[PDB]
Enzyme design. Structure first.
Site, PDB file in Angstrom:
ATOM      1  N   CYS A 221       0.825  -1.210   0.000  1.00 39.81           N
ATOM      2  CA  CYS A 221       0.000   0.000   0.000  1.00 39.81           C
ATOM      3  C   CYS A 221       0.862   1.263   0.000  1.00 39.81           C
ATOM      4  CB  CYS A 221      -0.947   0.013   1.205  1.00 39.81           C
ATOM      5  SG  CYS A 221      -2.396   1.081   1.021  1.00 39.81           S
TER       6      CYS A 221
ATOM      7  N   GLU B 192      -2.073   1.827  -6.747  1.00 36.32           N
ATOM      8  CA  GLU B 192      -0.789   1.127  -6.828  1.00 36.32           C
ATOM      9  C   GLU B 192      -0.129   1.415  -8.170  1.00 36.32           C
ATOM     10  OE1 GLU B 192      -1.931  -2.924  -7.162  1.00 36.32           O
ATOM     11  OE2 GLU B 192      -2.751  -3.060  -5.123  1.00 36.32           O
TER      12      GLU B 192
END
Length: 214
Positions: free
Chosen positions: A1, A101
């Site tokens: 993350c 991402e």
């Protein structure tokens, strides 16, 4: 993350999680408006205490000289000498529209195909309401699954509304929370994703355009 969006109003995120009478979250009509939420900022974080749901601004990061830890891997957190007390006593939910991402470098925005919010599993140092500057929360992560594997090898543990509500309950043990994290994880086929502008990489950019497809 490493980045997500939390842009709608509090009522938008709470509709699936809790009836009115269970919340102690004063009404605020203003959208949260954060399209580019970064580690090391205070983030509104949801948790249970005194039988009700509360929303506190909590530092995203957790330090025991290096930058604070921002994720806890689901494979090791429940048994981690550092994190297992938080797994037992500091569970929280961090709601979002979706997360970013980068694929090795092109950013993607990943979100629920039904458009409902994502309820990310977090752990952190209770009491969250003290505004701690060093012992905040972390986002629990999991291995990327299904199509998510061609973008990046990790993902946030996203929980169903049901599982997210049960995750937050004080009276459930770390062992029960481990069972909840497995069965309640939202699998990747429930998500859609698209590339976004590379501008999200700069935390200074915060416009609504950062989640739009390019």
């Amino acid at each position: 993350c490493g980045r997500f969006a939390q842009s709608q109003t509090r009522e938008d995120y709470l509709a699936l999680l809790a009836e009115d009478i269970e919340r102690d979250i004063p009404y605020d009509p203003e959208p949260i408006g954060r399209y580019n939420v970064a580690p090391g900022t205070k983030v509104l974080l949801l948790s249970e205490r005194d039988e009700h749901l509360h929303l506190d601004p909590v530092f995203w990061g957790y330090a025991p000289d290096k930058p604070p830890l921002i994720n806890a891997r689901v494979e090791t957190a429940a048994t981690s000498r550092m994190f297992k007390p938080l797994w037992q006593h500091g569970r929280a939910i961090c709601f979002a529209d979706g997360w970013f991402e980068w694929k090795k470098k092109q950013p993607f925005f990943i979100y629920r195909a039904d458009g409902q919010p994502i309820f990310m599993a977090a752990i952190g140092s209770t009491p969250f309401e003290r505004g701690d500057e060093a012992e905040g929360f972390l986002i629990v992560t999991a291995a990327a699954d299904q199509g998510l594997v061609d973008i990046h090898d990790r993902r946030p543990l996203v929980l169903s509304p049901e599982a997210a509500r049960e995750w937050m309950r004080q009276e459930i043990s770390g062992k029960e929370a481990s069972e909840i994290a497995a069965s309640g994880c939202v699998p990747a086929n429930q998500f859609s994703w698209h590339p976004v502008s590379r501008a999200v990489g700069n935390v200074k950019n915060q416009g609504a355009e950062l989640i739009q497809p390019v």
